Amino acid sequence: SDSAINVMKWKTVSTIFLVVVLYLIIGATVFKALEQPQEISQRTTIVIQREKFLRAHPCVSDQELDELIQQIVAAINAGIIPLGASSNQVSHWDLGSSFFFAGTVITTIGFGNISPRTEGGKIFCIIYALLGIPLFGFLLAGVGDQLGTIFGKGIAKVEDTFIKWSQTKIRIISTIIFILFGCVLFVALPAVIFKHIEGWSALDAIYFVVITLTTIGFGDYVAGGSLDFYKPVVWFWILVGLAYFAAVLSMIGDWLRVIAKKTKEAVGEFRAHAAE
């Protein structure tokens, strides 16, 4: 009964492993069905513009033109805007941007738009993270409980205004108004204000909002690029929005417990009778 439940646990983990593997295979085929075609469209139309530029200027160093392009791609790893118009440039590690960089590291967002290139900054970032990630975690948990009780007060009013002539079902009305206001306060309202500032689409905003507050942080779209009244309230929104998806992603996990137990007993009965 000590190492029995361990045998009962290893069976549980191994099944979840295959669920994730299949889930990754499911997603993979969907992305390469959605992305690999439009890749080859650009892949073949960039070969057009190369042979445009090579024949229009044969006296360019043909075999040493990619060496130019790749040293620009090596320079993509820095925030370059190397041009003849605006040869003068601005720091990407300035007084405010390095503050935002640390904001990504402790939240583990880490967009990657700007990464440290100095061996000193790398060793500092390692220690700054190993200490800042837990530090920020206690802030978030406090903000989560702080916000989780602000929600508790607003629902005490609403769960009286709908008391006509059961508990188990009133709980569902309460969970709706959280996601309702939540996707308004922490999805809708931010994504809209990012649309008039960043000039995105309507999807690019919510895509950004999700990728950011799910602490995935690709860095393809970043809000820190665009008053400077702006960036202080942004990382504040992130703090509370991270606390928001923390509950959202935790609720989705609870739903998947139910769906796992419903489908366990379902196939259990399905295979048990087998004659129906």
Ligand X SMILES: CCCCCCCCCCCCCCCC
Q: Summarize the annotated binding site for K(+) as residue ranges.
A: 108-111, 215-218
Q: Within 13 A of 165's CA, how many CA atoms are on the CB side?
A: 0
Chain breaks in the chain (C to N over 2.5 A) after: 165, 226
126 binds ligand X (CB under 6 A): yes
Of the ranges 16-24, 42-50, 62-70, 101-109, which one interacts with ligand D12 (CB under 6 A)?
16-24
Which sign does the torsion angle of CA 70, 42, 23, 108 carry?
positive
CB of 165 to ligand X, least distance (A): 24
Decide: is 84 part of the binding site for ligand CCCCC (CB under 6 A). Answer: no
Which of these, 215, 244, 232, lies nearest to 143 by C-alpha position? 244
Which one of the spans 156-164, 169-177, 248-256, 268-276 is the region binding a copy of itself (CB under 8 A)?
248-256
Q: How far is CA 268 from the centre of its chain?
A: 37
Scanning 73-81, 104-112, 158-166, 252-260 for contacts with ligand X by CB under 6 A, the matching segment is: 252-260
H-run or E-run covering 60: none
Residues 107-126, interacting with ligand CCCCCCCCCC (CB under 6 A): 123, 126
Question: Does 260 sit near ligand D12 (CB under 6 A)?
Answer: yes
By CB under 6 A, tell whether 181 contacts ligand X: no
Q: Beta-carbon neighbour count of residue 248 at 10 Å?
A: 19
Cβ proximity of 87 and 214 under 8 Å: no
> What's the chain's length in residues?
276
Q: Is 124 in the site for ligand CCCCC (CB under 6 A)?
A: yes
CA 8 to chain centre: 34
Half-sphere exposure of 37 (CA within 13 A, CB side): 5
Nearer to ligand CCCCCCCCCC, 13 or 127 (CB): 127
Q: Which does 211 bind (CB under 5 to 8 A by kind): a copy of itself, ligand CCCCC, ligand CCCCCCCCCC, none?
A: a copy of itself
Separation in Å, CA 58 to CA 3, 29, 45, 63 = 74, 42, 20, 11
Residues 162-191, interacting with a copy of itself (CB under 8 A): none
Smallest distance, Å, CB 131 to ligand D12? 5
Q: Shortest approach of K ion to residue 118 CB, angstroms?
A: 21
Report in angstroms how near the CB of residue 51 gets to a copy of itself at its nearest: 9
174 sits near K ion (criterion: CB under 5 A): no
- DSSP 8-state secondary structure symbol assigned to residue 71: H
Nearest one of 246, 241, 249 to 103, comparing CA atoms: 241
Binders of ligand D12 among residues 119 to 138 (CB under 6 A) are: 131
Residues that bind ligand CCCCC (CB under 6 A): 120, 123-124
Residues at the interface with ligand CCCCCCCCCC (CB under 6 A):
123, 126-127, 130
